[PDB]
């Protein structure tokens, strides 16, 4: 259905990005997770800015 | 034997001897009629937990039988090595298949 999963917990996307970050999953889901992480980091950077 | 009707019968001692698939088929056939006269005054949920550790023992037996062809698992993290002073240590991602031959 072209849908990402395991979004409920915060301690799931970090594990996914740290372990399944070399190409185990298709290029799309890993990119979605990376974009989410980058957005959260940009929010933190705005706070400190 | 494991007869869930009288709650004094089911215990982890017998579930270990029982296999993995047959208890599921066993519980399926047994009728709803459970004799009220026998009953654990010890928080019958303990017998439920006893059923869990029993099924866990049954599952462990199935894996032990399955362990004939698998590969020995190692540590998936670093820093776990008897003599790290010789050479560094790394984990391992379990992305394999246990089939050997």
């Amino acid at each position: 259905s072209h849908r990402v999963a395991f979004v409920n917990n915060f301690h799931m996307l970090m594990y996914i990005t740290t372990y399944l970050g070399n190409g185990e999953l298709p290029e799309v889901c890993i990119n979605i997770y990376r974009d989410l992480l980058q957005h959260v980091r940009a929010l933190r950077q705005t706070i400190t800015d | 034997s494991r007869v869930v009707f009288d709650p004094s019968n089911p215990t982890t001692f017998s579930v270990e001897a029982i296999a993995a698939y047959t208890p599921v088929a066993l519980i399926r056939l047994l009728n709803a009629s459970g004799p009220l006269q026998p009953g654990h005054r010890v928080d019958i949920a303990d017998a439920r937990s006893i059923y869990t550790v029993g099924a866990a023992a049954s599952a462990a037996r199935a894996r032990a039988n399955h362990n004939a062809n698998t590969i020995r698992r190692t540590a998936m993290f670093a820093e776990t090595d008897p003599m790290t002073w010789l050479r560094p240590t790394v984990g391992l991602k379990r992305t394999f298949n246990p089939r050997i031959i």
Binding site: M14, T18 | F77, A78, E79, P88, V90, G91, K93
Partner: protein
């Protein structure tokens, strides 16, 4: 957040630049407290 390999196993931070500084890579160094992190977050750590 990569516990597969120990931090600082083969690398250790030692930057000398106001440009190539790294307020985050210092976690790979040994003996790092919170006080040294907040201090390095503002002032770029460059050895004299």
């Amino acid at each position: 957040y990569d516990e597969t390999i120990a931090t600082g196993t083969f690398f250790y931070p030692v930057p000398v630049n106001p440009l190539f500084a790294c307020p985050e890579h210092l976690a790979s160094l040994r003996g790092m407290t919170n006080a040294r992190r907040v201090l390095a977050k503002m002032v770029p750590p460059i050895p004299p």
